[PDB]
Symmetry: C4
Subunit: 96 residues, 4 copies
């Protein structure tokens, strides 16, 4: 457990924190906007996961300024996490 494992390990933990907080903040931001569908927590968590994994079906998405702002954080933290693990497994193989 040097640096190339603690980084990916913390990123995975941080990601889960972002997913939980992101789904919570999304509901807070999306409510008050007529037509918004991202207004309940259980499906907001499902949205955050498919957002952080860059899947993004289209069944759920933010339509507000702060809602979309929260979404961007979920994307970046998502790509970084899934990208930091990739760079982690790369360094592992290089050192044999």
């Amino acid at each position: 457990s040097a640096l190339h494992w603690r980084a990916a390990g913390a990123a995975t933990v941080l990601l889960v924190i972002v997913l939980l907080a992101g789904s919570y903040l999304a509901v807070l931001a999306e409510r008050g906007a007529p037509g918004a569908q991202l207004i309940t927590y259980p499906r907001a968590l499902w949205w955050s996961v498919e957002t952080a994994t860059t899947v993004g079906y289209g069944d759920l998405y933010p339509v507000t300024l702060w809602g979309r702002l929260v979404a961007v954080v979920v994307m970046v933290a998502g790509i970084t996490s899934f990208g930091l693990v990739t760079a982690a497994l790369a360094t592992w193989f290089v050192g044999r």
Copy 2:
């Protein structure tokens, strides 16, 4: 065939197993839920592929707890597999 090839090789094999099992379990989980479209195996397999590749058009997606839970596994195993191959080809080039 050291470690940086057996890992990506097994990941590719494991991915296919996840895609097949994921498409099967998705149908089992989605059926019983009014309005769900992911309820037949042939298109479920197509959904699993576009899910694991993080494409996610929006033509098919789970709407149940366990259905979405299966989806998350397909995503993670998908990103990992396509990410483990990337880290595999990286190590190959580093060692010249």
Copy 3:
């Protein structure tokens, strides 16, 4: 121009070939299926690009067996290409 550049270079070239051929074969496969929207070449090329980049909005997608089969090739060749360039730039930085 060793191996970690010719690989990514060929992948980029191969990708364009897949995009052109994929868009052509998609139209051939999707036509004959009632309701299919991926039935003209100019927008098929646009679909292939957003497919290979794993974006996948949902404005265009295959609904046939062979159409979806062509799509999978576009995804895999897409992820590999954009992934082989990433592993190429990684090796470049490692060697200083």
Copy 4:
């Protein structure tokens, strides 16, 4: 701050420039086309972000030649940027 940091650093800066310019050029290209929804700047910026991150929900997408052409640049610059950072963190861990 050698090469494996200035590259990812410039890519991040360049990405923001592409997102801003891309959202601007998208509106210019999409307007004049009946049915197009990507016709205002604030939501165009939101579209560019979810495009560069390869999320692509389906709530917004270009339907014109030049609009889709701008989109491709946003995708490529997006994948490259998020990919150049990944290759940056990889080299960092390899050198210990």
